[PDB]
Write a protein that binds this ligand. Structure first.
Ligand SMILES: Nc1ncnc2c1ncn2[C@@H]1O[C@H](COP(=O)(O)OP(=O)(O)OP(=O)(O)O)[C@@H](O)[C@H]1O
Ligand SMILES: Nc1ncnc2c1ncn2[C@@H]1O[C@H](COP(=O)(O)OP(=O)(O)OP(=O)(O)O)[C@@H](O)[C@H]1O
Ligand SMILES: Nc1ncnc2c1ncn2[C@@H]1O[C@H](COP(=O)(O)OP(=O)(O)OP(=O)(O)O)[C@@H](O)[C@H]1O
Ligand SMILES: [Zn+2]
Ligand SMILES: [Zn+2]
Ligand SMILES: [Zn+2]
Lengths: 193, 96, 184, 362, 48
């Protein structure tokens, strides 16, 4: 269907570049590091959304004045005068900001809420920017490690014990090359097939 | 790596005796055999206490076993430490 | 020591066992002091060795600093140590530990408020709740409620737990007030 | 009469105990619905009001109904907890104290540490006649009596355990006992064991999960005074789902190490602040208006706050946010300062945090 | 992975003889039996 639609609009042929996830096993090894813990990644994204929503509630109730994002001094552009607007602003800007939401809102120096807003910015940076993203990277790295461990476990099992009878190589190796003789001539799964 | 080193130390101590090196599988034929062996028969704390006792005791007052171990300690020969053998293995026929 | 040696070298001997329960008390007293090791004897035969461990030695060994030293030594020999020099390292550790123990023995010369406040708050608030439940007016409410209703039962059933929740809130508030008073 | 009321009350208790979990789920769902509606407030203007910007106009009554329903469900969840989980807690506490009495003599020979809330509170339940109501072993008092009475004193042991002295043999000789009518309210009030209920209420109040549910109820109540207090109930997702608990274990497994790393970062930044306050004060002018300076390092507290708040959050460290050192006589020292701040604070310590999380996963 | 490969090499060499493949458990019935076997009886340097 995409190939047919490519004749109506040639840019639909770009959707066929998604076929590389299925054409090659080498790219599948890389993508398994993402798909192995995909449910955990999605749940981490949802948890990040909930935490940012709580931060949005706090900002909407206490720090509305700091969310003026207009350079023109005449007309304000308040991003936290509405709950939906404040949540969109946080999710879209503070998460993508290097130092968190504190990078993109008015400086708190001299205000009576200065210490509370400093705690707000620091905790946003520590929980959202530092920890949750670290959770994502840790999930990816742990997927790498888990796939590696599974492969070496398969190799270790096959090299140690016979697939059919389950007797370890220690018994068979009393005769030189006994284990390989048993697994290639006596109990070959190919022979059983 | 630090984690793995810690679990390796724990695994070694729980599996095999520090002194003789015999695994817990042999000793656990008797219920609680490994803990009995490692706390009553081959305790490293007991060995340290024995070295303290030999050092503090007068040389002329050693028994035969104490004199043997004392001489071996003076030449720093550690064959008196049971290596791969124990009382149970020695007397399997009579103890069992 | 004699009885222990006889028992260990004759595990199956009814008369010696009888002597053992006859001497149970003395053996129980001397158990912390009776130390056993096993050696490769002069007769090419594993032998049991029984000796005396002093109370000062056991205390110095059980001091937490010595425990940390033993843990570090075990970690070192297991990780970075081989098997050929293991006994040499163990003897060196024993010598150093013995010297430290002897020096320590030589130099050895010769929340409650919070718990009380929490207990007081618990007792006071729960006695208030018990006073609320048990009253001379409870007979009056009962005489009023000689007639049952399913709705009346539901209301009273809910109100009991509402009172329990309010009592918990009072207890928690009392805990915070007492904590602030004691810290200030 | 009272038999009928006990029957109906037991039905209600069993129903709540059965449906404790379903209604925790229902309260969580109602909390999500309330917060999704809360996403539609806006501020309107003295005193500013929070008003729903509803296109349909149906959302305000829906919010009121949902808040009332959430409060009711939280109350019923407390009830279901008390019916279902409290008996197990009481059983385990009674088992612990009975075993400590019989096999340790915690009150006969030893004593509570006087800083142990549980050990000191458990003194009350020993004297109660209905002490092992939930624990099966109904002979624990007799077992302790046989173990310690002859040696420690058969009178003081009985006094400690609340066992009557002459009632047993008086009843065995000639019981002379009469039935009591259940309809007598005074008789029922005497029958109920006041001290045991006091001890049980203390245990319940000390129980952590019951305190959490009470906090949930309090937040639900406060949500009626201010609807944004219902956002605190979204914290219940850390306990509702085990899948999120797997993710959060990667943070809580090495939590002490994370806190200690944060403290070490604070100490290192304090040392950098000391160095800057003693040598690099001139570079901390953060005012664009050339007339009035804004020196952030003319005070030690101000410099430490500036470093902690700005340099740590900066991508390249403190060097991003202070005056360029080119041409100065302290140029090389300040370059070393900035590079080492970037390498130790931005690169290493944050890497320590990520490594702690990844190692917790592993 | 590089770390694991190194510890695997070390574990194999310390556990079983390179030539015959018999584990150290059999040889250690005699004190220092495994090191005696791997340094005097089945030394790969000796084979070279
Ligand atoms: N029942 C069994 N049949 C075959 N091999 C067995 C069996 N049990 C254990 N093995 C072991 O499994 C391994 C076979 O590995 P594998 O399946 O990769 O095949 P291969 O002969 O190495 O070649 P290829 O990689 O081309 O398939 C050998 O080490 C063999 O000893
Ligand atoms: N020769 C030995 N002497 C003592 N313990 C041994 C010996 N060989 C093996 N072990 C084992 O080592 C463990 C002892 O652990 P460890 O050294 O931490 O002491 P512990 O008695 O557990 O207490 P602590 O942690 O307070 O020192 C036990 O599991 C024991 O079986
Ligand atoms: N056939 C074998 N020949 C030699 N060593 C063997 C053999 N089989 C097992 N080993 C073990 O391999 C280890 C030898 O380690 P390695 O090859 O590093 O040499 P080394 O003597 O420790 O010194 P170096 O590190 O200087 O080479 C010993 O633990 C030894 O028991
Ligand atoms: Zn087979
Ligand atoms: Zn041993
Ligand atoms: Zn060999």
């Amino acid at each position: 269907t995409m190939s047919v639609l490519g004749h109506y609009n040639n840019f639909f042929f770009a959707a066929h570049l998604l076929d590389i996830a299925m054409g090659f096993k080498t790219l599948r090894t890389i993508l398994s590091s993402v798909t192995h813990n995909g449910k955990q990644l999605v749940l981490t994204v949802g948890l990040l959304a909930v935490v940012v929503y709580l931060y949005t509630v706090v900002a909407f109730n206490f720090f509305r004045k700091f969310y003026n994002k207009s350079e023109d001094g005449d007309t304000p552009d308040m991003k936290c005068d509405d709950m939906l607007t404040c949540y969109m602003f946080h999710m879209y800007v503070g998460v993508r900001a290097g130092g968190g939401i504190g990078d993109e809102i008015e400086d708190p120096a001299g205000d009576e809420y200065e210490i509370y807003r400093i705690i707000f910015d620091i905790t946003f940076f520590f929980f959202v920017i530092v920890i949750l993203l670290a959770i994502i990277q840790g999930l990816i790295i742990d997927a790498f490690g888990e796939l590696r461990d599974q492969q070496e476990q398969v190799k270790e099992d096959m090299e140690t014990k016979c697939f059919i009878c389950g007797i370890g190589n220690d018994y068979f190796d009393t005769v030189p090359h006994g284990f390989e003789t048993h697994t290639l001539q006596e109990h070959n799964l190919a022979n059983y097939l | 790596e630090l984690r793995d080193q810690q679990e390796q130390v724990k695994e070694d101590m729980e599996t095999k005796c520090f002194i003789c090196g015999i695994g817990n599988d042999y000793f656990d034929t008797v219920p609680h055999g490994f803990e009995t062996h490692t706390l009553q028969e081959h305790n490293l704390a007991n060995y340290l206490f024995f070295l303290m006792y030999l050092i503090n005791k007068d040389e002329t007052e050693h028994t035969g076993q104490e004199s043997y171990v004392w001489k071996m300690y003076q030449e720093r020969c550690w064959e008196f430490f049971p290596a791969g053998d124990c009382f149970r293995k020695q007397y399997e026929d009579q103890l069992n | 020591v004699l009885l222990t040696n006889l028992s260990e070298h004759m595990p199956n001997d009814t008369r010696l066992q009888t002597f053992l329960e006859l001497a149970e008390s003395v053996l129980n007293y001397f158990q912390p002091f009776l130390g056993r090791i096993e050696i490769m004897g002069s007769a090419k035969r594993i032998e049991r060795v029984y000796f005396e461990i002093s109370e000062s030695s056991r205390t110095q060994w059980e001091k937490p600093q010595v425990k940390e030293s033993k843990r570090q030594f075990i970690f070192d020999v297991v990780n970075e140590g081989g098997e050929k020099e293991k006994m040499e390292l163990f003897v060196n550790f024993c010598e150093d530990t013995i010297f430290e123990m002897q020096l320590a023995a030589q130099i050895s010369e010769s929340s409650i408020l919070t718990v009380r406040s929490a207990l007081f708050a618990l007792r006071y608030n729960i006695l208030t709740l018990m006073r609320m439940l048990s009253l001379k007016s409870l007979k009056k409410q009962m005489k009023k409620v000689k007639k049952m209703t399913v709705k009346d039962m539901v209301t009273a059933f809910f109100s009991s737990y509402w009172s329990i929740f309010m009592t918990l809130l009072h207890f928690v508030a009392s805990v915070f007030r007492g904590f602030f008073r004691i810290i200030c | 009469f009272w038999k009928k009321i006990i029957a109906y009350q037991q039905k209600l208790l069993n129903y709540f105990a059965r449906n404790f979990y379903n209604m925790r789920m229902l309260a969580l769902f109602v909390a999500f619905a309330i917060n999704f509606i809360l996403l539609f407030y806006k501020v309107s203007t003295i005193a500013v009001h929070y008003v729903l910007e509803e296109s349909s106009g149906y959302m305000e009554p829906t919010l009121r109904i949902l808040a009332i329903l959430h409060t009711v469900i939280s109350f019923f969840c407390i009830i279901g907890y008390y019916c279902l989980k409290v008996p197990l807690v009481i059983f385990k506490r009674e088992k612990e104290v009975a075993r400590k009495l019989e096999f340790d003599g915690l009150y006969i020979t030893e004593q509570p540490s006087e800083d142990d809330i549980k050990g000191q509170w458990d003194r009350l339940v020993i004297n109660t006649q209905s002490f092992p109501n939930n624990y099966w072993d109904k002979f624990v008092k007799r077992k302790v009596m046989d173990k310690y009475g002859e040696f420690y004193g058969r009178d003081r042991i009985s006094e400690l355990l609340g066992m009557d002295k002459a009632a047993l043999d008086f009843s065995d000789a000639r019981e002379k006992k009469k039935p009591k009518k259940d309809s007598s309210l005074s008789a029922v009030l005497n029958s109920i064991d006041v001290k045991y209920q006091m001890w049980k209420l203390g245990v319940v109040f000390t129980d952590n999960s019951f305190l959490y549910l009470a906090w949930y109820m309090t937040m639900s109540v406060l949500g009626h005074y201010n609807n944004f207090f219902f956002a605190a109930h979204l914290l219940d997702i850390a306990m509702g789902f085990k899948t999120l608990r797997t993710i959060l274990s990667s943070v809580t497994h090495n939590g002490k190490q994370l806190v200690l790393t944060v403290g070490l970062l604070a100490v290192v930044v304090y040392l950098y602040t000391v160095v800057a306050f003693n040598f690099f004060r001139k570079f901390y002018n953060k005012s664009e208006d050339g007339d009035t300076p804004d020196m952030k390092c003319d005070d030690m507290l101000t410099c430490y706050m500036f470093h902690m708040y700005v340099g740590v959050r900066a991508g390249g460290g403190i060097g991003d946010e202070i005056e360029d050192p080119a041409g100065d006589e302290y140029e090389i020292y300040r370059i070393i300062f900035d590079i080492t701040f970037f390498f130790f604070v931005i690169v290493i310590l944050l890497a320590i945090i990520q490594g702690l999380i990844i190692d917790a996963f592993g």
